[PDB]
Amino acid sequence: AMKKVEDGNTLVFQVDIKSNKHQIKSAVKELYDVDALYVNTLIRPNGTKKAYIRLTSDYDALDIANRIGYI
């Protein structure tokens, strides 16, 4: 997941199983003040939903990850 944060400007999140890509894009905008280029979602073998959120070029995903505090 961190290779995507670095190479692809993509933040990888665990997301609620009931939420769609419109709600995920709004949620990341409201929580972290960042614009998503796209949201690719996925349901994992353990039953949880993972979102690959690519940010627009205006935002640096590594900076957002440090700001959240997991890198």
Binding-site ranges for other proteins (CB under 8 A): 31, 43-47, 68-70
7, 30, 45, 58: residue in contact with RNA (rule CB under 7 A)? 45
SS3 51: strand
SS3 56: coil
Cα–chain center distance at 7: 14
Task: Name the residue among 40, 61, 42, 37 with its Cα closest to residue 52.
Answer: 40
Could you tell which of other proteins, RNA, none binds residue 7, using a CB distance below 5 to 8 A set by kind? none
Q: For residue 56, state whether it binds RNA (rule: CB under 7 A).
A: no
Shortest spacing between CB 44 and other proteins, in angstroms? 8
